[PDB]
Design a protein around this ligand. Structure first.
Ligand SMILES: C[SH](C)CCC(=O)O
Ligand SMILES: C[SH](C)CCC(=O)O
Ligand code: NA
Ligand code: NA
Lengths: 369, 369
């Protein structure tokens, strides 16, 4: 067979939105945090164009939360990330790389400060809950760690502001990027952040009152018709163009933050302790020997399923292509690659095999646009 | 909306056997430990009938290892599990429930003792490596924790013993259940255990030398025609009939071992140190308020995708059906349910609504066969 079906089970968790999206045209799934995440609603290029011009509602429930509360909750959160949260404020979100004892990436979540003693870690695809539970036990921290009942719905695209203002009124229009607050829908208060896995604008509704969230979802589709609302999901083209990096795709637990472009989030000259701080000072002094870069490849199609080596003029491996797609903006394939220090330079040429032909590409900066 | 395609990416990791199985009729995938695991090679019932009579070769690479080595490795491994490993022997495998600070299940792995200071933990679908790393950091254990390059191939079914003797000779016939040793194929030594996720007999080859394992895979197909060898995968029908429990399906991180039938693996009265030991003591003394049981249901078809409530005659919820399938042995649907203390007793009747019909079922003992 060309394509393979996904086998559903209790373990591959459905979401509060599954029944809805399966009547709205979902065509493909991925699995993310042991949960179904839509991957396509037909053509990825059509979804891309729609996202960039209108507004979409996304089931991103698979963006699970790790809730850490109690007296040592701030310290535990800080312990897991190289980002300095000492001046963090309630009602703000923070991109916080989580690192291990080697200094290598575990996850790249967004952390929400709900209170000094209550934190939500909105996670990429790894079981951060168990890292946090292991740490808390070993460090004898006084915390409560749970995966709360939170199922995010995202509202993304340029018309997201107009749609959300229609439903929630003027107060939501004051919400700054990476801020959050509480908004009423038909008597139920929902936490809403101005965030989401696109650079096309919008919000994430951290649904705790599930039935109210389901009714909100339906209401967004009803009153969003004038904005050409449609279903959607994180988009492969948009996210590669925007250089939104994906744990497990672009970087993994063999990579450190300096190989990923995360330099600005590694706080080494502060007084905070976090895992691997150690080794990260050593890495920063010598500098990385490999780093994420963009590539362009002159061909019009690709289906990347795993790393592909890229090569030099003496056919020595100089990198690994990790994410890629056809970009309508460039009218060629673009992608994200881990490249050796010899080949970092934007415009640097390389070779790659697709099917059985050697094809030229070149290195470029991130983001692409 | 009936079947949906899986969307491949680097993050949904391929295996050393993917290219082979995709020429041998794989039709559906699940995701297990962030890795592709075959779910079907066409009809499940046909696969079931074949497994029960003949022999299958399975890509179960998604059964990842956590390797913990070094001076404090034995202690860290024991810290994670309620199973007493104090008399454990090199060359033996042990079923070791992994427990958190609440006494709840994190994973149900099998642990292989390679050396006093080298342990492989063969894991179910959760990121045990991060639990280990968290614990090691807080205790400052002198250990190395890695996911090694190990990609299990299983050989399962009543003809597995004969096929493996054909390749490896008399000495493999001496291997006892849940034992392992090293066996030469074409000059390369492979760790082989008598284990696997069926009750139909066989082995798991813990392939480290990937190229050799690939050659072995091909060789088993060539020399296994005598035994009607075929490809296959963990089988839903067989595993439910055999009462093999799956983390995320039948039990999860809200459940403790005394709700799951794991009592024989919980060591409370020895000197071992592990998480949740106190709470397990507290829990064992009250007794569980819910437990896994078997069910039989009077219809001939089911497609279970998540928990289904099961009801008494007056519409009170008395449990949750968590895994189910049509069983050709019973000529009806069977399954595994978490049932409340009021309604455990074997033979207790219940109701379940499947679309337009309320269907009768009853509670039963595990195992079914
Ligand atoms: C759920 S999004 C925030 C991430 C999707 C991806 O990594 O492919
Ligand atoms: C990989 S098997 C050992 C388990 C598969 C399942 O839990 O469905
Ligand atoms: Na989701
Ligand atoms: Na696998």
């Amino acid at each position: 067979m060309k394509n393979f079906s996904i086998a559903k089970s209790r373990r591959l968790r459905s979401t509060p939105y599954t029944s809805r999206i399966e009547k709205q045209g979902v065509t493909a799934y991925t699995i993310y945090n042991h949960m179904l995440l839509p991957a396509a609603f037909g053509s990825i290029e059509d979804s891309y164009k729609h996202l960039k011009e209108h507004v979409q509602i996304w089931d991103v429930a698979a963006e699970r939360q790790v809730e850490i509360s109690g007296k040592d909750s701030a310290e535990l959160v800080q312990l897991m990330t190289c980002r300095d949260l000492s001046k963090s404020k309630i009602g703000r979100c923070y991109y916080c790389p989580i690192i291990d004892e080697n200094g290598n990436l575990v996850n790249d979540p967004v952390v929400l400060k709900l209170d000094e003693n209550k934190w939500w870690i909105s996670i990429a695809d790894s079981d951060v809950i168990f890292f946090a539970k292991g740490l808390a036990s070993g460090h004898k921290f006084d915390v409560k760690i749970v995966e709360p009942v939170v199922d995010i719905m995202a509202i993304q695209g340029p018309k997201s502001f107009a749609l959300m203002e229609k439903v929630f009124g003027k107060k939501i229009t004051e919400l700054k990027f990476f801020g959050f607050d509480y908004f009423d829908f038909e008597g139920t208060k929902h936490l809403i952040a101005r965030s989401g896995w696109s650079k096309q604008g919008g919000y994430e509704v951290y649904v705790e009152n599930t039935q109210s969230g389901q009714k909100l979802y339906d209401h967004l589709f009803e009153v969003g018709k004038e904005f050409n609302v449609g279903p959607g999901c994180p988009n492969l083209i948009e996210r590669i163009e925007s250089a939104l990096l994906s744990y497990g795709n672009d970087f993994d637990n063999n990579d450190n933050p300096f190989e990923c472009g995360f330099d600005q989030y590694v706080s080494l000259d502060s007084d905070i302790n976090f895992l691997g701080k150690e080794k990260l000072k050593e890495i920063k002094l010598k500098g990385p020997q490999k780093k994420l870069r963009g590539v362009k490849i002159d061909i019009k199609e690709i289906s990347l399923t795993g790393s592909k080596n890229i090569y030099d003029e003496n056919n020595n491996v100089i990198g690994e292509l990790r994410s890629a797609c056809y970009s309508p903006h460039f009218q060629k394939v673009i992608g994200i690659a881990m490249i050796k220090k010899s080949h970092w330079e934007a415009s640097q040429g390389f070779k790659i095999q697709i099917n059985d032909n050697t094809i030229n590409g070149n290195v470029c900066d991130l983001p692409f646009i």
